[PDB]
Amino acid sequence: TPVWNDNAHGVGSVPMHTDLELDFSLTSSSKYTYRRKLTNPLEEAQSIDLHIEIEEQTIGVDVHALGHWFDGRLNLKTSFEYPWHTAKCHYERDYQTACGLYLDQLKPVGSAYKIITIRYSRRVCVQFGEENLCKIIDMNDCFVSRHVKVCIIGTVSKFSQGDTLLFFGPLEGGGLIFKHWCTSTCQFGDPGDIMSPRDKGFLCPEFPGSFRKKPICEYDGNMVSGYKKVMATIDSFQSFNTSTMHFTDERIEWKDPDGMLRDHINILVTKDIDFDNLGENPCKIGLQTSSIEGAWGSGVGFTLTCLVSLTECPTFLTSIKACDKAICYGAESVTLTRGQNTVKVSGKGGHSGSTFRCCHGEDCSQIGLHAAAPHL
Amino acid sequence: TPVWNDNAHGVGSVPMHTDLELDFSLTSSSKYTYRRKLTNPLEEAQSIDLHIEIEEQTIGVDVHALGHWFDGRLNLKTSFEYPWHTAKCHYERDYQTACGLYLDQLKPVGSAYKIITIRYSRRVCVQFGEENLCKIIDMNDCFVSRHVKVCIIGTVSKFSQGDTLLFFGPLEGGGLIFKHWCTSTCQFGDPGDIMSPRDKGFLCPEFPGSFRKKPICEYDGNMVSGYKKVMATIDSFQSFNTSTMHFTDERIEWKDPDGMLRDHINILVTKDIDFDNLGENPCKIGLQTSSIEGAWGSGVGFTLTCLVSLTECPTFLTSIKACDKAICYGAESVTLTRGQNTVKVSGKGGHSGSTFRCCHGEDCSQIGLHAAAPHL
Amino acid sequence: TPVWNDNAHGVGSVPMHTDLELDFSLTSSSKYTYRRKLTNPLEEAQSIDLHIEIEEQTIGVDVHALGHWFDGRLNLKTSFEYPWHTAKCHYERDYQTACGLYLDQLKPVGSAYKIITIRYSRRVCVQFGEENLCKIIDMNDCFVSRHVKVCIIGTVSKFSQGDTLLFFGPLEGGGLIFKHWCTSTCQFGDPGDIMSPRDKGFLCPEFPGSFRKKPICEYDGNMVSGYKKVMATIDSFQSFNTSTMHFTDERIEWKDPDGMLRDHINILVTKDIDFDNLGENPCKIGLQTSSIEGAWGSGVGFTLTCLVSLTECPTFLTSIKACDKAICYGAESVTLTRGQNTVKVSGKGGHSGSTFRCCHGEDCSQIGLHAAAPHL
């Protein structure tokens, strides 16, 4: 007969038995503080200190680092080993008189990152009497305690999965969003045309045009680099700004200082009688990894297989997560049955050093597994 | 003086005269159950069974089926009727010595679908005493009854109108999202380059390169198929997973098992005094279709013209919908006047067998009209 | 010790001391009216007229006007000054016999606009007794008064920054959304291929193909205009409809009549004891501009530097905005310190005549500054 479920983050309340509601739209890039002494209706000399601190909205973006975009010049040469053979990016036609194209005057202009996942959050700290609790609350999730609920509801449409972020300088400060960075076909002149994915090695663009032998060679395709073409119409692209940036491997976090954006905050307080925590349950979970497949740094992602032991309940509807170092990369909602369970969790993100663990709530397995590299 | 309006789905309440509030963030891919006996404040022996069941979030996507994407090999031949003339996809230059390109070793690799409309919903069932009511509630809509309101608020940014969904296998399980599938220009090498829209008939890609007569012909454009180019950088594309998929003509429904996504649920209950239903009204509507124009399976859509009779009110602000088989494809907000009204409803989606009806609430006209086919 | 903050738009309430809550999902394209006489619990003969009017959702889009898209025919000519030299858009090869391509039969087919910023709002008017106040409330913001709070929460995903809107006719009524309008590379056949940014002057597309001398010239690249290619697959593109359109320089406002879209409205009323306004503060701000850099009509945007004087508080967490004529284009959240402050505000949008002012709340500096033109 029981059907325990902890996927509901929130409370049941009797509106007569609640003491304070705060409900407001908050600038995303602003913190908020509330301090009050809760006092009994003139009846008694017993007061409770309430102290709420909501931190500025943070964005966390799981990315694949694409390396550096380059500017360069396309050079045409006529011969009759090509004189230009040491150039990494080249194109040739033999007449049997050799025509060649090669890229030179290469210069890195920026660092590019492919967006895999976008998540917004606020750190929320609540002191109620001698209780003090801080939690990072995802947008569209809730902080739940015995006497205080804090829910954050919002929407942002600035970034999308698949977008490519370009940072030109030591770009704290800001960057550009590209919605059409070249992937499966890179032609000279495209955004993303000339890349170096790591220290060495260029991924060269295609040169779709034709040679002509005139004996002076000509090439009739585009001769302008993607960097120059983008700069020539730079106002066509969307900038964004950043503050207190934190790059880690395959992840970027920052606070967006765009003060036109807002989210909704609801705070409900009950002074005497505790809230009914809708996720309360007696079920106990043990976790370990079994296997993994797929890749980090990949829009396709990975799948972590977990062995999950349920005791103290016949069944338990919950979520098993793939996490490492308190960042979670995936979750699977599942009705567990008493005893052993096998649960597959699909995730995306992470880096070569990530060990993806099976987690429930704030509890994780003792070890995690490494996923494979992308773009092999 | 009256200005009746049923476009508000919700209730007016006196917060002193409400008995229970449930407010929580729910994993999108999870159901939720609440069961309680509502009992009078120790005053009386009269209790009310409350039973709420909220089903997992479902996505419904109106699509245009694009048929199958193919892999193939581009073959070059020299002649001096072309030997390769039976190939459906070809390109030739005459020297007067004929150079030809043709596609062969064709193989379907997946089924593609263009997104026209995305909508999320949850089925919500409420029993209050001997009252039992179930309704499919769209995200950002509300379940309204005399004693219980259930509102769902949320946002998802995974899919967008215009995206193309590719299913490789018998793909329940999952697929890929393409944001740049070729439409007005398909060149060999693009995602979507080689399509068969129906059983027979290829839509061939362009071959933008040039022939050279060397006498051996050469072609200096791209020789790698779109499938191979995409597979070579597959980690650049976004996967999604599915569960309990339901394909119908020009529509796909499933439950997304991504447990990182959440939505917000608010449940308000009044035990004694009924809620004020904000859409309550005495107005009565009769409906029939008059005409239609435009297309099913189309991002441009159709327009259904309805003849709508209003009685028992001088005016009535409401919505007239275009629906068939309990799926709605469009709605027009309108202030009707007593007597006959002509209302145009813009819609998108549906298939060749759809008969789009004029509807108000859960009431529809006796017949609907067929829209025209797209891509003629 | 004080930490004043007006970035919270909302109220603190005691749920026992609140008299009425309205909570509902409203058709976006519908207005809503509520009228009630608030009367004391049978105790007294003193009533309060409440009158709330919520107007239909409006979209406001800051854009860059791109001018007109054209259809045309690509003509091939052989010579042996080119006979076709007066054509603005042309391409030639000399054999030393001259081959030329030129565009002719040009006709404007529509007006194009690049989306820079999208914002939705509703005008909300509240009369409570002899108090009457109207305000334009942004989606995800709140109307706050002593006795009434109105919050709007919603999400829409129809338009995105970077999209290009095309209006074919005198297009009130509607238009098309393009997600891939050509920017840094325009080739003949692309959406956006042939543009005239202003009265005169074409921005000509590239012709990526090759000439051949056969002596009759041939050109082996695409010969079909972007307009014809898009029309041939028009159902692949997304239409939208409009009502009561208002074009101004670099801005379009309208009401979207799509009645499938909804947003959430919450109205809270307290009859006796005032709400605690969470943004209440004694701080006083003076403002003037100092300098500006960057551009109007640009996805990259501008930065307005403001000199902001704070008195009556040691510190004040607030937002400084860049606005003109009651439209705001940017905001910066900032903790001001007593005395003079320098605050940089990043913004986007506006036009050549805009004078961007430093603003706080509904108060603005006496003059604003002009930003520079885009696309120089």
Ligand SMILES: *[C@@H]1O[C@H](CO[C@H]2O[C@@H](C)[C@@H](O)[C@@H](O)[C@@H]2O)[C@@H](O[C@@H]2O[C@H](CO)[C@@H](O)[C@H](O)[C@H]2NC(C)=O)[C@H](O)[C@H]1NC(C)=O
């Ligand atoms: C969720 O989706 C993953 C992803 O794999 C799928 O990706 C789609 C884009 C499409 O290409 C489809 O053909 C492909 O299977 C599924 O994982 C995959 O499962 C297959 C079959 O067991 C394995 O051969 C793959 O190695 C495996 N890949 C990864 C990265 O795990 C997964 O089955 C599916 N369901 C769940 C519950 O995660």
Ligand SMILES: *[C@@H]1O[C@H](CO[C@H]2O[C@@H](C)[C@@H](O)[C@@H](O)[C@@H]2O)[C@@H](O[C@@H]2O[C@H](CO)[C@@H](O)[C@H](O)[C@H]2NC(C)=O)[C@H](O)[C@H]1NC(C)=O
């Ligand atoms: C809502 O928009 C439709 C769509 O038609 C418009 O589509 C735009 C993309 C653009 O191309 C514009 O030029 C075009 O009119 C409107 O319906 C169309 O109306 C015209 C004029 O009466 C008819 O000739 C078309 O056949 C008709 N098409 C369809 C599919 O109905 C419609 O008028 C507009 N308004 C409403 C209230 O629906």
Ligand SMILES: *[C@@H]1O[C@H](CO[C@H]2O[C@@H](C)[C@@H](O)[C@@H](O)[C@@H]2O)[C@@H](O[C@@H]2O[C@H](CO)[C@@H](O)[C@H](O)[C@H]2NC(C)=O)[C@H](O)[C@H]1NC(C)=O
């Ligand atoms: C917010 O971003 C703007 C935009 O400028 C940046 O745009 C990025 C897309 C990228 O190209 C980056 O290299 C570039 O700086 C910043 O304004 C710029 O600041 C620099 C340095 O002072 C000036 O040289 C520019 O003229 C200036 N441009 C504009 C339009 O103002 C700005 O510093 C940054 N921070 C804030 C708080 O606005």
Ligand SMILES: [K+]
């Ligand atoms: K080539």
Ligand SMILES: [K+]
């Ligand atoms: K060609």
Ligand SMILES: [K+]
């Ligand atoms: K060319």
Ligand code: NA
């Ligand atoms: Na060529």
